[PDB]
Amino acid sequence: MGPGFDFAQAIMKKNTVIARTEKGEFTMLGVYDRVAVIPTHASVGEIIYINDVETRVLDACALRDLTDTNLEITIVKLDRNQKFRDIRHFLPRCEDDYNDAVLSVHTSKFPNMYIPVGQVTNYGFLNLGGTPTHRILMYNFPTRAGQCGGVVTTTGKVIGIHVGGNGAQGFAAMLLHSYFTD
């Protein structure tokens, strides 16, 4: 509908796949080469389904900060025959607050879904499903089951992936450029 939705659509059309684990279907953001991200509560194993194709997992790493606190991001390398467009230049370098973000989801349950969530706060610490979690972004939208792994963007930046909510607020794990130096 406007330039925020334009940037979000461009990311969804080229840099997302539908990932299925034993814990459900998730929006999965491809970042570069065969490297993608998913919430850690997806519990990625040795095999994952990518757009309904059985795919070997070459590596999976559940990220933690240097206080050894959960970040809720798992970086997955996929045994896939095709690379993602490299979008690492759209990742923020530092923890920040943002205006006018869009949360975008693409699954069997929620195809081509886009939500203007408005202002995004650097919330920091969250007890997420009983797990102490750092680098959380917060937005005042009543997000629901089915939206985990959803991509949070502003114009020109990919800032986070949706990892939970409390019925009134939604929460995303930060994406930082430093996670994807190779």
Q: What SS3 string covers the chain?
A: CCHHHHHHHHHHHHHEEEEEECCEEEEEEEEEECEEEEEHHHCCCCEEEECCEEEEEEEEEEEECCCCCEEEEEEEEECCCCCECCCHHHCCCCCCCEEEEEEEECCCCCCCEEEEEEEEEEEEEEEECCEEEEEEEEECCCCCCCCCCCEEEECCEEEEEEEEECCCCEEEEECCHHHHCC
Per-position b or e across 105-134, b if 16+ CB within 10 A of its CB = bbbeebeebbbebeebeebeebebeeeebb
Long-range Cβ contact pairs of 62-71 (< 8 A, separation 24 or more): 63/179, 65/134, 65/135, 67/134, 69/132, 69/133, 69/134, 70/40, 70/128, 70/131, 70/132, 70/133, 70/134, 71/40, 71/133, 71/134, 71/135, 71/173, 71/174
How far is it, in rounded angstroms, from Cα 28 to Cα 79?
Answer: 15
Which among 61, 59, 52, 56 is positioned nearest to 79, based on CA atoms? 56
How far is it, in rounded angstroms, from Cα 153 to Cα 20?
Answer: 23
Which residue bears the tokens 């840099």? 15
Rounded to whole angstroms, what are the CA distances from 144 to 115, 147, 149, 165, 166?
12, 6, 12, 7, 9
The two three-digit tokens of residue 127, written as one number: 């007890």
Decide if 50 contacts 78 (C-beta within 8 A): yes
The experimental method, as deposited, was X-ray
Q: Which amino acid is at 13?
A: K
How far is it, in rounded angstroms, from Cα 47 to Cα 162?
Answer: 23
Q: How is the chain split into domains, by residue range?
A: 1-15+85-182, 16-84
Residues 6+ apart with CB under 8 A from 101: 4, 116, 117, 118, 119, 120, 139, 152, 153, 154, 159
- Catalytic (active site) residue 72: yes
Q: What angle do CA 158, 24, 86 make, to 5 degrees?
A: 25
Of 72, 106, 134, 162, the catalytic one is 72
- Catalytic (active site) residue 61: no
Of 25, 106, 134, 148, the catalytic one is 148
- Catalytic (active site) residue 106: no
How far is it, in rounded angstroms, from Cα 112 to Cα 73?
Answer: 23
Of 41, 106, 134, 162, the catalytic one is 41
Decide if 64 contacts 74 (C-beta within 8 A): no
